[PDB]
């Protein structure tokens, strides 16, 4: 499987202290079922999103069925099934920092994975029971679809 | 329609001195977003004052309150009805326009609201102020049953449906409101398929509600041990050809592909029953049925953590907060630590509504010997635990005991209760045994503080 | 008309009742509480404040009723473990435990005179047991499917009962027999209590709506539409003007006796309203739910 | 009586029954049948 999360998400706030680049946003969207922040950044450009949008939003540590485990390449060539043949936006990044509400005793109930995928951040902050398939330095992929309702 | 909204498109920018293109706006939005024809009724409002000083007509504040009265407005709403009534009277002229039926109508929305409003008094008071004016209608006739339906359904709620049966049965929504009726009482079963042919006939067709009150009625005969026999193997055959004609007539309809998962995860394909019921899933989760029968796949793959929750989200709704049905597909192949005491607590939440059904207080004690043998077989543990086991497994001993004298069963005879006697016989002297250990290990931390405090003492 | 005190996580667990006192007897002033975390927490309401005084453990399983002693500053508390564990509000310790085993142990009823204590039996009888004696006195035979509520009149000249389908079952505890069987109500009653003059009687049934009955000629007075939940617990304000409902909708809607109107509503309560109750005077209104939270609510 | 058809033909049903039968988007059953036939055939 290597489905490490999966939710629907809806857009209500974009660039909220202002748009500084040309390409890039910032999407705080919030979940529907899992009640979860989500703080992704898309280029606006080539997939552009307006407000009240809803998307499927899938991190996944491959894009195969079977999970294979891929190296980590750039292979076109390749005719193997892949699971972003129905996702209009793809992506693949590294998480690097999972903060969370830790303390001395007792264990934590909410975290927060940031990933970066070469540049554009991602802070799905929330409980901590979703998030046990992020663990740092992995790479993850992001594989969202716009929902027309 | 599109051609209307482009049109409308067209007269809104521009400005000839609009009066009524709002009202043709509005006029379509009603069955898309609910705001738009809103703000058409808003705007269209204040529009009709600057010509001269003429009050709104009723028909618009009826209709705007009636879209109010859907949303959480309903105290707004209502004020829209009233004032609409109020102007709907004030037209004695108007009989070419029937100010009557204004009234009317606006009326029955307001008794509609006051039934939403927590307050049947006024609702039941407003309908039969209709019915006294003209009894020739359905619909207050209709409504009046289902609130006295709600006290019970032997009152006069069953009465009143076939009276207004009676009156037209050439209306659908009464005649399935009978067959509403027999839902209650599921002993008319194989009984309920004649009184759901009545109006099967062909100018009636096609009629997708009584083709799935049959698919319904035929699922319900389902999940007996008599599958073996070549009937259940039939009634499946039978719902999935009912299930295949609606959905060929209607591939939209999403209680079809409900039924189809339904019949599949009964075929014994869990696995491809996620991906039938995705689409019933993404096109409206928020139904009753769809939470559960995913959950049960969830629950069936070993997957409590991805089942509680979607059990937990059906009972978010406003009708009740401890169901039995729920808390029964709730506990099912719990073992883990946090599923063991807390479904104790659930299945308690549970039988505090209502203590009669038997599964509870037998899912009760199992779940108390489990934890008893899961504390005084393999532990060694903690030894308030160990007093605490004794305590539990005799209460769980006592159920036992009063389980036996019960007549009826879940369909099933609970004589199989002497193997779990048996089990607590010997769990009784595993705890008898394991008292020792917990003295033993209290007589351990004793010497260890002992030989703690001499080394505190040479400091 | 509003909210004095917030007690915020007044329970680790659900809180399903709410005692509180009504005379001078030392239980006014102190709020015993029964929830499934198996604590019977006695808090005093000292100094306009809601302070814990006592905490009582014992129950096997969690609290199903608490109600304090009329006449007496001692309490009670029952649950489904069958071990009706009697309490002092004196000392915090345990004057003993009716064990109505194997199972047959529902909600407390105090009496007036606080010397007998009805309990509802799963057979459908109402087993009396005495205070100071524990063993069964004498059992009403009134059989059907089981009692889901007792109450006993504040002066003790009736006593009714809910069953699971609506049926109302006027005792006479004077004489200890029958007198009448009110069936204006098919879903299951889940708390009733008499009128501080007794004479009338609040059903809560499972259907929205407040009939309230009479007890002297067993008749209807009215029908109330109460909430859109089911009314869970249900007082009468001591100096008999209004009364308070408690349903499962997270809305605490206070009747009329008089007029069947609202006259106020809290929605304070995140989660479903279990029990309230009134103060000596009725002014401060307590509430419980499962929210946890303990609101005492003001009525000036 | 004439309050009937006074009533009946200035309303408006824009929900009736049938339709909160088929859901408000298109899903059509190219992508159902599809499994259902799958399904079939490898029993």
Redesign the interface.
Known sequence: AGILFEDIFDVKDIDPEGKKFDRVSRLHCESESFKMDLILDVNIQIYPVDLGDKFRLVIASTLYEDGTLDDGEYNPTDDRPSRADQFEYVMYGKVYRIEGDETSTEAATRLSAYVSYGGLLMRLQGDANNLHGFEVDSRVYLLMKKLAF | RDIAKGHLKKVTEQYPDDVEAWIELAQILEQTDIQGALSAYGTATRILQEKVQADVPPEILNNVGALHFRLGNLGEAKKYFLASLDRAKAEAEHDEHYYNAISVTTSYNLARLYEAMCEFHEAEKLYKNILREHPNYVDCYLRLGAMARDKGNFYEASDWFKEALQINQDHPDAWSLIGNLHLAKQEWGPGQKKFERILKQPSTQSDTYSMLALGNVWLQTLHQPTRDREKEKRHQDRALAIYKQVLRNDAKNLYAANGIGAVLAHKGYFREARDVFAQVREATADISDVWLNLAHIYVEQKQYISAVQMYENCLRKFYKHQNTEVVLYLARALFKCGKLQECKQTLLKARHVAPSDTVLMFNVALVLQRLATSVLKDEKSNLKEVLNAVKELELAHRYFSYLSKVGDKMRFDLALAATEARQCSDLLSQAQYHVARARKQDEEERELRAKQEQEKELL | YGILFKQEQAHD??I?SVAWGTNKKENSETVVTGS?DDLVKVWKWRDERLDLQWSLEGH???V?SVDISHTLPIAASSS???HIRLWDLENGKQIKSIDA???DAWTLAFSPDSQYLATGT?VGKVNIFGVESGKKEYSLDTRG??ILSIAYSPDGKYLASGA?DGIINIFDIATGKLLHTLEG????IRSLTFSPDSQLLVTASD???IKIYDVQHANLAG????????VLNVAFCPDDTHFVSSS??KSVKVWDVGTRTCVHTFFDHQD?VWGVKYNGNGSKIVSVG?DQEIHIYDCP | VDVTRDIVSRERVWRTRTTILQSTGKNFSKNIFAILQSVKARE
């Open positions: 667990d659900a399903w499934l096997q399983l969690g199903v489904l473990d069958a085993g194997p199972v799963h499917k089981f699971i109500h098919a879903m299951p259907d929205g709506y029908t109330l539409s109460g909430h859109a939940s089911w499962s909708d479903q499962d």
